[model samples]
Target: VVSIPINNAGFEDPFIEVVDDYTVDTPPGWTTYNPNNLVPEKRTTMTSNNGVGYVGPGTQFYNQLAPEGRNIGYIYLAQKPGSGVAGFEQILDATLEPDTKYTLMVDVGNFGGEFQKISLAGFPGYRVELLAGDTVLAADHNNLYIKDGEFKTSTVTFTATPDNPYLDQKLGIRLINLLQGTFSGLDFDNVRLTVEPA
Candidate 1:
């Protein structure tokens, strides 16, 4: 069993703590960029989205960097222009037993655009590797392609087998805009992790 600690200390952004069963570490090689530096004169998350409850650059800008300066972590790109990419990474201290089954879930939405895309990279040892060398665990390149103003939820379920050694290694998630060279607003919430009986 796995438990996540919830922090409700009046902060806008939600904090997740992994406890008891395992230790969580920040994935290596992830960094955050200032939108102001990327695009001067244009409004970015640094100013407009500085308060609580907002993730990268408001729901419109991209926030692509992990807590630590490790690997080329997850990158979240907004569907609108001016907004760049947001990245994230999660590391597990416990060595995953061979052939174990684990479930990962996250909530995502596109405020009002054609679609939102998510991509993932698996690094069993947290070591740097070429994109060609790295494996693409999951890709929702064509998941949300619509013009609905309402928010939507999407879930993905998969098994962590020894054959996929990274199953026991560190896992990361990234969101990007499917429409190349464009930036729009996107939202993510309620990220959860669970372990299935072996």
Candidate 2:
């Protein structure tokens, strides 16, 4: 068994402390993209923990604590239907190895603000993927049922055979916000990946 290094695994890079709120910007080692114009825009951000006890959502609060460090990754989507997917991703220095099994684990949060109510009755859904170079090896597409203001771990796995063409290709991780009516954003934290000989 081997643990792969994932930079900023806890969304704690380029840190900024806020009074009692969160701020928006691409975190270190991650690239964000919202390719479609119709998607509107909500900059990528990470929540800050005030000197007090709060970890995220200045006004509204969550039922769980931050699964990683003092911060969690946030990616927002357009406010309505007919929007495009928005996301952030990172490609690791490591590459896929033949005859190896890979596993990816990520913590995903559902943001249903209480102080300021959100339009989406539930989550807009999200996708977590493990990639080889530019191709997807395995993915978890909103398969877990998470409640409002809560976090859950999403797991995705892949096995690279000796004959797989993607062997030696760079490994990657992706988190995407899917389009749904009354959509808003998603919160993520605690990214991890591991590999073992098959």
Candidate 3:
């Protein structure tokens, strides 16, 4: 069995640490392409309000993007007008099991823009095909939108089928900021994956 260690290192607090086997690492072949041309700092260390650790921008690092006494209420603003960035992602090596139910749990909030997308390893731009109880549930194009400051957990149920067999897959989580959308910030913590009894 292949397992990745979480960065936070403990599981007492559910909100802060999601998947026990998966850890947050920088995307190897991915790049951070800031569309707005904003000089946002690429940070490696940040924590959630609940103190969960991640590799994205947070309230403590907000000052770096908003210098000169600009106090945005939220931590990482991606919904404000003329204040958005793109291409912030982390890649994980995950191998799904066939005929098994996997619970994909993530702590996310909508800070503005469009919904976030989850892509598989082989299919870089395509989402992971989802199955449930011998039936094809949905295509691999699911998107989730979250609210700012308010943390919400997204629990998605998935099954690997013969049609779309499992392989060494890379998972990508991406967020997009909308036009004229300012102060749209999001925080992701405790990303976990677990197997359920079939």
Candidate 4:
């Protein structure tokens, strides 16, 4: 079995020199898409070090420490109009190998802790996808059952045979936040990928 090392797997980018209040920045080695280009409202932010769980008042405040490290990826959906889906994605140097089994894993979090007037009981839904080139090999789509302030593991598995269409294509992962209530959010960390003979 082989584990693929992904850059900033724990979302600890711009590594905090000192543990002060966290700051928001785009995570390194990943790409994010905002359908409407909303500013300060609809976007992905990296909460580093002590700044974790401090994204904003309307979002969820993590009750427990981050599952992985001092950093966690946070997504904020607009409340004015309630935006659509937005997410983080990364393409790995690893490629899909024939006759191999691939597994992608990520820690998915729910915002249960309320801030100000915002209260969340049910999650806003999410999708964790594993891809080969542009083709989706496997996905865990809104299937994980988690409670507020809880983090759960979401796994996606795919076995590629010699004749697999996307064999040799680059492997990639996408973590998406689906549409839900206004001002809803999701947290993610500790992304992992591995492969073994099938």
Candidate 5:
């Protein structure tokens, strides 16, 4: 049986704090990877109603109801000067198995209708990586921006490195938003990973 366990994949658990409800921090099992820069983070957890638990500065773009559930995670892909592309990372409950192939995929999307006073915009792209510590075993990039109001699956497959000394390494995955011309970004849900015989 596969040992990987991904929690709160839909980003349904939002952590709201302070009187202003400033940061809708990620749910358990996932952690935001803030870039080393001056501008503050802008990631958010949103419901299908287009409402955010934690509000912040800038244009809030994720408005579509979740394709599968009442909640979805909004990611920022814009990394302009002094700012970083906002994304999150998760460490599975198990380590990689030698000679085993694993499939990693997630539902990704963007807004369709009006967002604030502006029309919708597509994100530049995103990266999905199967990682063992700081090294990436396999990865996929969407470079092509997904159409607004569309749900698409992005997948990547990888096998454990048998010869690597870190054979016992615990597997992890990173969902990263690529840089966009604008500061807005994309939506995500139903993140998943599965494994079987190669």
Candidate 6:
């Protein structure tokens, strides 16, 4: 196995739009996998805007430094009836080997302030998951999460074998927003995936 290229892995594909400092829709390489029945605009987004994009002191570090690029992805977790959640996914450019070890690395962190009834201490966690089709292969799920005004690196590894039915299908990576109490935020950047063949 080799390091298959992942387009816009850092959520900086064609670059995001900024209208008075806010993001637009994510697509061309992403999807929510949900029907068009419930909410309105219920998907994570890639942006270069402040607050809504990178955490910390806002514009001070807008294009300065991130895990990788000047821009980053933000996942806003809203638990309202049809609000939205901070989650995103991408299908890789290549197929996984029948028996190979793969590793995924991403920069994750939490947003500032509280979410209605939820306090800052109510952060559940942040995660990066590997999936083959709809079958989950592995993840970096945990109780350890990103802190205020900072982003942490999460490295999740997995192996695909002959026992797996989705090995020959498109490989996917998911950025998840896990919250403990209510609505909140999770920021993601510099998504990297590499593979080692059997």
* Top candidate when judged by lDDT against the true structure: 2
Over the stretch 63-101, how does candidate 4's per-residue lDDT look in tens digits? Answer: 566678676776655543346676777899999899888
- Give TM-scores for every candidate, taking all chains together and pairing residue i with residue i: 0.45, 0.84, 0.41, 0.80, 0.74, 0.73
TM-score of 1: 0.45
lDDT per residue for candidate 2 within 5-48, as digits (tens), equals 99888877746566225555567778775555433343232221
* Candidate 2 vs 6: which has more TM-score: 2
Once superposed on the true structure, which residue ranges of model 3 sit more than 4 Å away at CA? 1-88, 110-148, 165-180
In TM-score terms, candidate 5 sits at 0.74
Which is superior by lDDT, 1 or 6? 6
What value does the lDDT take at residue 113 in candidate 4? 62
RMSD of 1: 12.3
Report the lDDT tens digits of candidate 6 across residue range 10-122. 76654535421335555336654322222235334432111234222344322234567555776544453234334677887677668788888888765545435655433
In order, how many clashes per candidate? 26, 0, 20, 1, 0, 1
Evaluation by TM-score, superior candidate among 4 and 6: 4
Error of 1 at 140 (Å): 2.9
Query: Against the unseen true structure, what C-alpha lDDT does each candidate score?
Result: 0.32, 0.73, 0.35, 0.71, 0.60, 0.60
Summing lDDT over every window of 10 consecutive residues in candidate 6, give the lowest-scoring window. Answer: 47-56
Residues 87-157, model 1: lDDT tens digits: 23333334444444445444443333222363221111111111101344554443544232233334444
Give candidate 3's whole-model lDDT: 0.35
* Over 4 Å off, model 5: 1-3, 15-23, 36-65, 77-84, 143-145
| Poorest stretch of ten by lDDT in candidate 1 | 123-132
So what's the TM-score on candidate 2? 0.84
Clashing pairs for model 4 are 22-51
Off by over 4 Å in 1: 1-86, 92-96, 112-135, 146-148, 177-183
Error of 3 at 136 (Å): 14
At residue 80, give the lDDT of candidate 6: 39
The number of the candidate with the highest TM-score is 2
